[PDB]
Amino acid sequence: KPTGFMEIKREKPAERDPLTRLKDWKEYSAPFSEEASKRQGARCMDCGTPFCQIGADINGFTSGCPIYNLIPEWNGLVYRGRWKEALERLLKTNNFPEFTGRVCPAPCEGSCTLAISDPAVSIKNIERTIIDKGFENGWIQPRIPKKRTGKKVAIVGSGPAGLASADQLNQAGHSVTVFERADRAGGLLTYGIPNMKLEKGIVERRIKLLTQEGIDFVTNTEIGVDITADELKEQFDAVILCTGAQKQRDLLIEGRDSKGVHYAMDYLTLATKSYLDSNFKDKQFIDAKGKDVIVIGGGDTGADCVATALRQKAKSVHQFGKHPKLPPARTNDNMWPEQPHVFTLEYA
């Protein structure tokens, strides 16, 4: 007779104090301990017809884990205390737990049955704890599929979609090659997402695991002027166009010509590359230590820009947005089947 949903109160892991969060470029959170993870997993009530797994566009906003994670199953396993089985069930469907757990904004938390007037179960944190403990114990090892048929797919783009497709094709038994412009594979996971969210050591470890599988990445190949499409088609049967979406809309307003105005993507890429190269000692990035910083455009990009400016120790930072400030709780035109629009107050 599970009763955790009412006999337990949701908690959070041990986070580094904010006043010291601004000094070290490292992960700003840690997974649960064993007892805390068990207690949090116990909350989920073996929910029949779960609403944390619908994963479909609802009213213009996503809801539920789109990759169809077996959330009730591995929550029950986490509560029971068998961790290898939970890891196996998680990896059955998901392929990049180490990124999903510590990057995904967790629409599953926002939308599930237990979220009716009560705090939701920490699906994201449980997933992160599972994958982190698995990696620490070293149960994850390269699969090395024995069966192989000579073929060729040439996935283009090193983003998460490209990596997932390459892993699936390699498990199928078809040789693949990943063409990337940037020095290091990963796409957004490397440069776009900040070090804070995704320490690049984990990304590099996963890419090394894929290379051990045999993906055989190739770097510094913009597959445009360098390599022609006709030759690519002749040399490779199919091509999975994970080309990405990096073009950013511009504000057609006078005054946006003077030096100083910069693009969030370019600035983040420069800063992350400089840090990964020489701990931002190369002096080839954009500095704002003694200058004001203003970011236009709310969302994850704005939050990342604010965080990067704060770590660069800008004197003042202000975030601007046209959308009115969100309410502090659910409103009449917002319901739990849909992703909420409540005040969040995330990191940074």
Partner: protein, 1483 residues
């Protein structure tokens, strides 16, 4: 309806006995209902001895020899004459070749004009044939054998020719008259009966009910020898087993006549005719009538500790060679010079008989059949179960059952035979080996396992010791429609008993069950000796690995073993033929055990569906007449559910070895989960599976695994008629469906995918009992759920339309989704069709248990529906009377549909009278043949107070209605309820099933105003998971069959059909209306509107939304509102009206039944298997009327109540003044008091009147259900003897029953009440001056009673009150008694200990002064009101009586009473003390 006989013991004969038998039949007539017209005879007949005097006086042209040296025949002919004389010549030729001399022929004069129209039209011709006796025939037994040979040869020739004629009887001591005649018509029709020349010894009779309105003269009984009551639920397996043994019967008495008599049974005959044929064959074979009757209808011999060793050995021996024939039955056979009478192994019918100083036994269904002198009556006994009432005319004495049974048992050394000849297969303990395959995942995927299935069906079984429960019954699409590959098992749906028989219980009635299974080959049945019993016998159908290996390794020459590979490559027909070849080769070699193994299966060889393979093998063996020589053991991986197990046993499998499940448990234990040991896990799984099989058996009513084994109790849904005839002959299928090629393709697809499986090492999640994205589609997906909720909360119509579109299209959910409109008609404007206010009056909320739901949710539902103007409903958990008054704000929480379930929890005079309509919960969609359990933890005080039980006591609701043992009893209950509430409409709740048309016709004849057909898709508070998934059929088939049968019979214009179950859209409503619905029930949808999220956790009592949980903490989270329900109903009505505009229909009754507007959609054809269905059965409109116009005239008028009692008692009831009257009551007057009780309750209410305000006297025999629903303040002095169901649903008042004034014998030792008394009563008193019947005080809940002895199963499910038995007690006393007290007097303490069921009762000795004083006062009132000598003597010897009394009280009841008493002594308020005690008890 019933039976009767008026026999003179000493053998003296007169016409008076025949006349009295006819009078008895006339009196018995009243039990039956009305058909098309009252004149029609549903079936009746009379049996006598041969009237030699009349024959010699009348024939005048036959030289009749002496009494015993000739026989008389009775033949029915058609109206034509050419076939008549041809058959006459042929019968004469048969007699001449057999060597007997035909004396002549005679024609019976008949009065055709004295008969109804239909029977006049069908009137057949009658001729009696006289047979001669040759000098060789020394013995009348040989003469009867030759006559039987002649009759069977003639029947064989007739069936070969195809003509239509029947032998009513051909014997030297019995001549039978019967037909479609009322008893008042029989005497006029058969003018022979009017002559004063007949002289007989006995006169058996019988009246049929004719469930269907189209009977034939042949079917109506008395049959050739015996008269039968009730129905047999094993009549398919019965016939299969009998046909199998047919080819192997061999004996010397018949010589070579077995070849002539090869067809021993009538395949087309009904249960009674089949039983008569089999019984006659057995008794002619050379066995005594009593011996063969005992063989056919045995007592409970397993699990019973009240039986003698000789009897136990006797029944153990005979069960090893012949299976039992279960079902409600009251046999009364004859053989010319001996008579007998038996009840089934459970005693489910009444039988009370008289004895007089002139030796006139009067054995009949009820008591007051004929007028008898109370100064001459000697014995008033009851034919208790397992007791043989046997009479021998030549000896002229009632031979005692005990000595008959003893000498039958001792006739042979059965005990020694069993002790010696049994075979021991003791396994070696050192041969253990925990088997593993190393391909567990591959085999599991091949056989269709899922992680959901494992973690939700296997571990819970071990954890809880029982099958896991559930709620929100299955809504997934049928297997035939589901796109995902499904095993053959899903196509087969279980069955259950609705009417003509109760669903018997198992846990409480364990003494009746029998799980003994025999393996091997049966011997010579007719001359059996030691080789019928040199066989292996098992305790459970399931087997363990060690047991299976021991059976396979047994090398005894007589018991050989063979292994047959049930596998195929491409051709299923080739595989089955090859399997048959191996089987027959092994039989020729001499094997006795066959092992169907799915092992050694690789990518090239795939397994046949085990159900199909077993059915094919069983049918082939039965056809070739070798099944009795073998034993089919099955070893299939796909055997893990009780459903699969029960299917295998029912269709032939001797034992199952779930090696795959055992290997899975081994793997889990090795991994670490399920810490329990391997052997303990295996034993627990076996025990749980056996318990589940017993539960499935109890659902139908078959109480013997041996009987169920032959019985085919499944209804294929989606299998072609040709395939069913070929392999599953006898199974019922409506739509045909998929074929052998499609089944093979499905199996091959599954096997190929599973053995490919080259991507992962995990089992895909199941979707049978939960929804997982990408799994099997479900009716209530999250998209539909939240779209419906949003639309309802916003009052927006576009969102609701989107929800309807999503729910209906994009998938195949149900049969009704395969129907589409033609689209070429005349649309009509939305302003020209009937209005939404008219629409919404034809909706219902469905039964909603107050225990399952919360008070807020229940009141919201009731308020919403009452405001809308429909008809709300109240569940079986009663209702607080505080809801019968509207609130100041205008809300009305009263429920318009009061349900009368098996529990009878809240049934009361007030609760029944303050209502608008009444339902009878014969079954629900989810758990038809099962009851329920509400343990102490889940029964809170605020529910117990409403349900009239002690707080914190586990309540039990018996599965069957103990007042419903047949359709006649159903009609009686319907009349009782109508008399209780004359100003209401009676309703019945059925479930779609094969024969549901026949059941509906029978109910309509039983005069039920409204019939409700509920599909299995409906929800439920709690039920076993397999009962959820594999029970019932979709309501579409049931509704179509019921409508067709009703309107063909002509009664469709006398009832009002309804529908419910996943009615989620106006399209579904329109489909139901076209199929023939009139009012609809929405239960699941209103819950979703209120806030339910279909989480499927109601049984857990932990609803997160607080819709189906009693916890106040969760209840505080509720958010529902009646406005949402109102909006939902309005949107449904508006969408329906839009479709009415589309279809151009003007009015409801105008559209109803117009199925011609329905045609199959092209999507069904596009579907790869759904295109093979035959829908003409549903698309078919016979001529007739299709709407309810007639008022369903009841017979409330002319009742003794209205005639005499009320007219002189209106003043008394209205002025609250005392009044006294005396009335003469006969058995025809049924209820006699419920009307006055209802008037009192309506005028005053629960309070009633001062004690002893109305003092009604009565005299003579009373009617059935006498004094039911009597309120407080009334008093019914019944100076006589009554019939069944006395004091049904009592709600106060006194009931004093004393024997007749002219009866001077031990009235305290002669039975004076029927089987069931005080069923479901709540409070009152009673003083019965005699023994009671079987199941006395079944559901007493506060009524104090005093009786001198009771029958069997007495005080079964008490939950309060007290009982004081001044005498002996039957076996299985206090079976499931969860409350109350029973001060049972007794002398032999140890014998009482043994008789009582020790499961849930604690015994004591009276020590409390208050208890002693209460008993003394009760006995003082008993004597003051009865003048009972036993009570007077007990009062005189009180000093010894107090010591000799014995007290019984359940543990939980005692502990709760002690705790609440302690709290009250401490000095706490009643409510807080009750809450504290409940918390302490159920921490």
């Amino acid at each position: 309806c019933g039976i009767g006989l008026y026999a003179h013991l000493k053998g003296k004969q007169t016409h008076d006995i025949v006349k009295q038998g006819l009078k008895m039949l006339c009196q018995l007539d009243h039990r039956g209902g009305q058909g098309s017209d009252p004149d029609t005879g549903d079936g009746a007949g009379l049996l006598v001895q041969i009237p030699d005097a009349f024959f010699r006086k009348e024939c005048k042209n036959i030289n009749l020899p002496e009494k015993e040296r000739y026989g008389v025949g009775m033949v029915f002919f058609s109206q034509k004459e050419d076939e008549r004389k041809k058959i006459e010549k042929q019968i004469n030729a048969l007699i001449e070749q057999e060597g007997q001399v035909v004396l002549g022929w005679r024609t019976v004069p008949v009065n055709v004009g004295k008969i109804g129209t239909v029977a006049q039209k069908s009137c057949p011709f009658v001729r009696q044939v006289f047979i001669g006796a040759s000098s060789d025939l020394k013995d009348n037994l040989s003469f009867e054998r030759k006559l039987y040979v002649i009759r069977k040869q003639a029947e064989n020739w007739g069936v070969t020719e195809g003509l239509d004629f029947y032998f009513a009887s051909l014997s030297s001591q019995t001549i039978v008259y019967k037909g479609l005649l009322t008893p008042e018509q029989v005497d006029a029709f058969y003018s022979d009966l009017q002559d004063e020349a007949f002289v007989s010894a006995f006169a058996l009779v019988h009246s049929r009910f004719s469930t269907n309105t189209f009977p034939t003269w042949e079917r109506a009984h008395p049959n050739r020898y015996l008269v039968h009551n009730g129905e047999i639920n094993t009549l398919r397996g019965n016939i299969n087993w009998m046909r199998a043994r047919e080819q192997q019967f061999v004996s010397e008495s018949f010589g070579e006549d077995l070849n002539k008599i090869l067809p021993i049974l009538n395949a087309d005959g009904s249960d009674s005719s089949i039983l008569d044929n089999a019984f006659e064959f057995f008794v002619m074979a050379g066995r005594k009538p009593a011996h063969t009757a005992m063989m056919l209808i045995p007592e409970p011999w397993t699990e019973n500790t009240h039986m003698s060793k000789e009897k136990r050995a006797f029944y153990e021996y005979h069960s090893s060679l012949m299976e039992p024939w279960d079902g409600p039955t009251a046999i009364s056979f004859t053989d010319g010079k001996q008579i007998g009478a038996i009840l089934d192994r459970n005693g489910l019918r009444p039988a009370r008989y008289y004895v007089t100083k002139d030796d006139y036994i009067i054995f009949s269904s009820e008591v007051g059949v004929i007028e008898v002198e109370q100064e001459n009556v000697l014995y008033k006994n009851r034919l208790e179960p397992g007791k043989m009432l046997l009479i021998d005319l030549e000896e002229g004495r009632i031979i005692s059952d005990e000595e008959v049974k003893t000498q039958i048992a001792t006739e042979y050394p059965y005990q020694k035979w069993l002790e010696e000849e049994l075979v021991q297969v003791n396994p070696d303990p050192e041969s253990r080996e925990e088997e593993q395959f190393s391909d567990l995942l591959t085999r599991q995927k091949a056989f269709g396992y899922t992680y959901e299935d494992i973690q939700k069906y296997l571990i819970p079984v071990i954890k809880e010791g029982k099958d896991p429960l559930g709620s929100m019954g299955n809504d997934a699409p049928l297997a035939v429609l589901s796109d995902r590959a499904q095993s053959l098992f899903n196509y087969f749906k279980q069955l259950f008993a609705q009417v003509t028989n109760p669903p018997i219980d198992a846990i409480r009635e364990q003494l009746v069950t029998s799980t003994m299974t025999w393996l091997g080959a049966e011997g010579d049945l007719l001359h059996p000796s030691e080789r019928n019993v040199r066989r292996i016998k098992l305790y459970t159908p399931v087997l363990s690995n060690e047991q299976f290996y021991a059976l396979k390794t047994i090398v005894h020459p007589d018991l050989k073993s063979q292994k047959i590979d049930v596998l195929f490559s491409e051709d299923l027909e080739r595989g089955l033929k090859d399997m048959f070849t191996q089987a027959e080769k092994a039989i020729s070699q001499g094997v006795s055990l066959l092992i169907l193994s799915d092992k050694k299966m690789n990518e090239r060889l795939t397994p046949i569906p085990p159900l199909l393979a077993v059915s094919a093998l069983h049918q082939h063996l039965i056809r070739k007449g070798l099944r009795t020589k073998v034993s089919i053991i099955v070893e299939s991986g796909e055997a893990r559910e009780v459903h699969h197990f029960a299917a295998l046993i029912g269709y032939g499998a001797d034992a199952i070895n779930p090696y795959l499940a055992y290997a899975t448990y081994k793997q889990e234990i090795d991994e670490g989960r399920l810490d329990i040991s391997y052997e303990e896990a295996v034993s627990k799984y076996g025990k749980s599976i056996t318990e589940g099989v017993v539960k499935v058996m109890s659902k139908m009513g078959i109480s013997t695994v041996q009987s169920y084994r032959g019985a085919q109790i499944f209804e294929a849904v989606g299998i072609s008629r040709d395939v069913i005839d070929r392999y599953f002959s006898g199974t019922a299928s409506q739509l045909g469906g998929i074929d052998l090629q499609t089944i093979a393709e499905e199996a091959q697809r599954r096997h190929r995918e599973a053995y490919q499986d080259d991507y992962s090492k995990t089992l895909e999640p199941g979707s049978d009992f939960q929804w997982r994205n990408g799994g099997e589609h479900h009716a209530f997906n999250p998209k539909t759920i939240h779209t419906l909720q949003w639309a309802c909360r916003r009052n927006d119509y576009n969102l609701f339309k989107q929800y309807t579109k999503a729910a209906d299209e994009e998938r195949i959910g149900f049969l009704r989704n395969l129907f589409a409109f033609d689209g070429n008609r005349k649309p009509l404007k939305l302003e020209e069709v009937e209005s939404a206010e008219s629409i919404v009056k034809r909706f219902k909320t469905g039964a909603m248990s107050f225990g399952s739901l919360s008070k807020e949710a229940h009141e919201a539902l009731a308020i919403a529906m009452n405001r809308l103007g429909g008809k709300s409903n109240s569940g079986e958990g009663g209702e607080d009377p505080k809801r019968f008054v509207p609130d100041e704000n205008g809300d009305d929480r009263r429920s318009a549909i009061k349900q009368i379930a098996s529990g009878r929890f809240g049934v009361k005079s007030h609760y029944l009278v303050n209502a608008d309509e009444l339902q009878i919960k014969m079954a629900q969609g989810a758990k038809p043949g099962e009851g329920g359990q509400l343990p102490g933890n889940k029964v809170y005080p605020w529910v117990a107070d409403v349900r009239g039980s002690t707080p914190g006591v586990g309540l039990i609701s018996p599965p069957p209605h103990h007042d419903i043992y047949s359709i006649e009893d159903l009609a009686q209950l319907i009349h009782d309820l109508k008399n209780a509430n004359r100003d209401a409409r009676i309703s019945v709740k059925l479930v779609s099933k094969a024969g549901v048309g026949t059941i509906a016709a029978g109910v309509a004849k039983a005069t039920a105003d409204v019939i409700v057909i509920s599909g299995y898709d409906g929800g439920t508070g709690a039920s076993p998971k397999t009962s959820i998934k594999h029970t019932g059929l979709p309501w579409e088939l049931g509704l179509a069959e019921a409508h067709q049968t009703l309107m063909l019979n002509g009664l469709r214009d006398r009832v009002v059909l309804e529908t419910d179950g996943k009615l989620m859209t106006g399209r579904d409503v329109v489909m139901a209306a076209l199929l023939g619905a009139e009012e609809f029930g929405f239960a699941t949808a209103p819950l979703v509107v209120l806030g339910c999220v279909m989480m499927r956790a109601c049984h857990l009592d932990t609803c997160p939304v607080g819709v189906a949980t009693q916890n106040p903490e969760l209840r505080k989270k509720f958010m529902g509102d009646p406005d949402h329900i109102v909006n939902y109903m309005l949107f449904i009505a508006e969408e329906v009206r839009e479709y009415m505009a589309a279809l151009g229909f003007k009015t409801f009754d105008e559209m109803i039944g117009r199925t011609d507007v329905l045609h199959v959609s092209e999507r069904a054809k596009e579907h790869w298997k759904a295109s093979q269905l035959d829908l003409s059965t549903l698309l078919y409109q016979p001529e007739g009327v299709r709407t309810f116009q007639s008022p369903q005239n009841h017979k409330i008028d002319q009742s003794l109540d209205i005639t005499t009692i009320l007219p002189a008692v209106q003043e008394a009831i209205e002025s609250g003044k005392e009044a006294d009257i005396s009335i003469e009551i006969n058995n025809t007057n049924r209820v006699a008091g419920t009307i006055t009780g209802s008037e009192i309750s309506k005028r005053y209410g629960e309070e009633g009147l001062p004690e002893d305000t109305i003092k009604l006297h009565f005299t003579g025999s009373a009617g059935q259900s006498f004094g039911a629903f009597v309120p407080k303040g009334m008093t019914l002095y019944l100076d006589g003897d009554s019939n069944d169901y006395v004091g049904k649903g009592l709600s106060g008042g006194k009931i004093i029953v004393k024997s007749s004034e002219g009866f001077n014998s031990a009235s305290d030792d002669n039975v004076i009440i029927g089987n069931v008394a005080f069923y479901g009563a709540t409070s009152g008193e009673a003083y019965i001056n005699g023994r009671a019947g079987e199941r006395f005080a079944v559901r007493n809940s506060g009524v104090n009673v005093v009786v001198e002895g009771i029958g069997d199963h007495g005080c079964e499910y008490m939950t309060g009150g007290s009982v004081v038995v001044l005498g002996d007690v039957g076996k299985n006393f206090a079976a499931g008694m969860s409350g109350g007290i029973a001060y049972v007097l007794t002398e032999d303490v140890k014998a009482f200990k043994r008789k009582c069921n020790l499961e849930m009762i604690l015994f004591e000795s009276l020590e409390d002064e208050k208890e002693i004083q209460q008993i003394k006062a009760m006995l003082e009132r008993h004597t003051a009101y009865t003048n009972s000598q036993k009570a007077e003597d007990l009062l005189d010897q009180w000093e010894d009586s107090v010591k000799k009394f014995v007290k019984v009280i359940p543990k939980n009841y005692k502990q709760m009473l002690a705790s609440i008493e302690e709290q009250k002594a401490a000095g706490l308020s009643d409510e807080e003390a009750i809450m504290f005690a409940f918390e302490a008890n159920t921490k």
